[PDB]
Design a protein around this ligand. Structure first.
Ligand SMILES: Nc1nc2c(ncn2[C@@H]2O[C@H](COP(=O)(O)OP(=O)(O)NP(=O)(O)O)[C@@H](O)[C@H]2O)c(=O)[nH]1
Ligand SMILES: Nc1nc2c(ncn2[C@@H]2O[C@H](COP(=O)(O)OP(=O)(O)NP(=O)(O)O)[C@@H](O)[C@H]2O)c(=O)[nH]1
Ligand SMILES: Nc1nc2c(ncn2[C@@H]2O[C@H](COP(=O)(O)OP(=O)(O)NP(=O)(O)O)[C@@H](O)[C@H]2O)c(=O)[nH]1
Ligand SMILES: Nc1nc2c(ncn2[C@@H]2O[C@H](COP(=O)(O)OP(=O)(O)NP(=O)(O)O)[C@@H](O)[C@H]2O)c(=O)[nH]1
Lengths: 297, 314
């Protein structure tokens, strides 16, 4: 029994919504191919519940799913089963807009109307690229896109596969791309988002490189051709020994897709690296490219 | 994998709605008791799809379920499981508004806004009656009440358990009121396959139903409390629907079926209104007898009704 028990009405509606659209989809046949209209398509449902089942859900709310055929195909191509996705969102309220499913597999980010517009703008080529690279990429894996109406307020969400391990604690993270670096207050946060300079003058490398670089180049090239910028490479680091204070450094490469073991010859950790934030050319790409090509040793 | 394929979009939407509402209710816990708000409550869903899932469902439709907590409970008290209900409605399209589920277990009747209003008016009392009578009644067993919206047009529907068997074939039928006013069937109706014979038609044939005392007493006691309950509310024009199954004829028809390619028994948990003919009647038969259409004065209407049905059978 999924009650859609959550800290805020909006989370409840998200849970309800994912549950609903995925059951509905299970009634929709898997087609031989995506079609042009699938990229211009949506489902919309409006709920108006008088004196009923408003123990957790708002009595009145809307839920809209952009291009459900496309995002179900992306799901399949990312090796993700519809039932597991549904369970991750619904079996328990997602946790604290930036959200994570209770099991930490999927990230739910609140986004703008123009982010949604832009996603629609890249979606065909992005899909074709996921096809052509066989879901082997560092780009965000987009799993679903929704608009929620709650108390008259529209909210937009995008679901991605988590960059980080859904199990291995991340001990230090960097957001790589002038010059930028972490603030005098952000550096006082539990897990700080460090930047390029904090990384450079700290003299850190990542002993691992072939796959990562081939992949990364192909990706940032694709992002260039779409005239997109501002995207960052998210890097996460889990210190095995630090955890050691069901084995340490143990993970499922088919789940934690971006995870990477430290090379046998190293001062032992787990790295997670993936490109985030591309919903916004050449120079940015080659600059980004070279900066990241110099972290792997 | 339910496609909701149907010859009319109204039916697809019916299937989708029962499916959707039953699954939703599966998330809703079963209460210790029903509350007053449960009798004034409704669920409403409005769907506007664009360029998506249009092979069977229309892109735009509305579905409303009346007092769903109540009807769920009613289903429980009539020994009908929600998954079975759902399956009966959605596994395959209902068939010919007067519909029957593909498996013949449930009747879907198209009604009026007036009808829906009267359901609400009588619902708390009908519920309590079903409670204190333990589900043992000739009255319609109400299982669900819905409003569909297709093409800006609104359609109300009431679901009941079939009075007739979901398996056994009905070879003759009567709609009986007991009116002093003459009630026969038209040449039109009499030319139909299974005509709806009426009062004077029943009188004319010297027709009688022999069920034996122990079944007669049960029947008549049900009937007496039923029409007394109906008389209490301002309820009139309701009928006794009478189906007659010829066991022998059926064995014959089956035989013609197996040739061109058990006997007179039934599950009373399922064919709730079925009665075997008396161990020593002429031809052996099964009858189905229920009160239908409950949505001069009511008291006398029920005296006039009860005397006629009381004489309908020995
Ligand atoms: N655990 C986890 N955290 C993430 C993931 N993606 C982003 N984050 C974190 O959430 C924040 C959101 O970053 P971003 O997508 O750039 O959103 P933004 O608001 O446009 N940028 P900013 O970080 O400056 O606010 C980042 O600081 C990052 O640390 C993820 O997949 N998993
Ligand atoms: N006694 C009673 N009648 C009710 C109740 N709910 C609905 N009705 C009656 O049932 C009839 C059908 O109502 P319905 O078609 O749902 O629509 P509506 O409530 O009129 N408004 P709308 O058509 O805008 O949805 C109406 O005549 C209404 O008065 C209730 O709780 N109690
Ligand atoms: N198989 C079956 N037929 C039923 C059932 N209830 C009613 N009918 C039939 O369906 C028709 C309509 O019955 P009724 O409820 O009186 O509807 P109505 O609209 O009030 N009357 P009518 O349609 O005859 O003018 C009749 O042919 C009746 O015999 C039922 O449970 N099962
Ligand atoms: N009462 C009765 N009629 C039968 C029986 N067998 C056949 N008939 C009737 O005889 C006719 C011819 O039968 P068939 O051999 O099917 O050709 C049919 O009208 C059929 O109803 C039987 O065992 N009993």
């Amino acid at each position: 029994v999924k009650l859609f028990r959550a800290s805020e009405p909006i989370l409840s509606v998200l849970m309800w919504g994912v549950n609903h659209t995925i059951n509905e989809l299970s009634n929709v046949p898997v087609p031989v191919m995506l079609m042009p209209d699938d990229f211009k398509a949506y489902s919309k449902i409006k709920v108006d519940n008088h004196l009923f089942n408003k123990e957790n859900l708002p009595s009145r709310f809307k839920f809209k799913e952009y291009c459900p055929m496309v995002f179900r195909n992306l799901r399949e191509r990312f090796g993700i089963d519809d039932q597991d996705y549904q369970n991750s969102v619904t079996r328990s309220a997602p946790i604290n807009r930036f959200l994570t499913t209770y099991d930490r597999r999927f990230v739910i980010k609140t986004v703008s109307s123009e982010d949604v517009a832009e996603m629609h703008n890249i979606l065909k080529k992005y899909h074709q690229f996921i096809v052509e690279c066989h879901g082997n990429t560092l780009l965000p894996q987009f799993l679903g896109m929704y608009r929620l109406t709650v108390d008259g307020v529209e909210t937009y969400m995008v679901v991605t596969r988590n960059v980080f391990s859904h199990r291995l604690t991340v001990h230090r993270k960097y957001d790589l791309k002038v010059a930028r670096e972490a603030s005098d207050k952000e550096k006082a946060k539990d897990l700080p988002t460090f930047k390029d300079n904090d990384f450079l003058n700290e003299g850190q490398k990542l002993h691992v490189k072939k796959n990562f670089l081939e992949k990364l180049k192909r990706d940032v090239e694709f992002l260039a051709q779409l005239k997109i910028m501002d995207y960052s490479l998210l890097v996460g680091i889990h210190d095995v020994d630090r955890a050691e204070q069901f084995g340490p450094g143990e993970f499922d490469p088919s789940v934690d897709v971006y995870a990477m073991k430290s090379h046998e010859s190293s001062p032992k950790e787990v790295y997670f690296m993936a490109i985030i934030d591309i919903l916004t050319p050449e120079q940015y790409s080659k600059r980004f490219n070279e900066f990241m090509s110099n972290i792997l040793t």
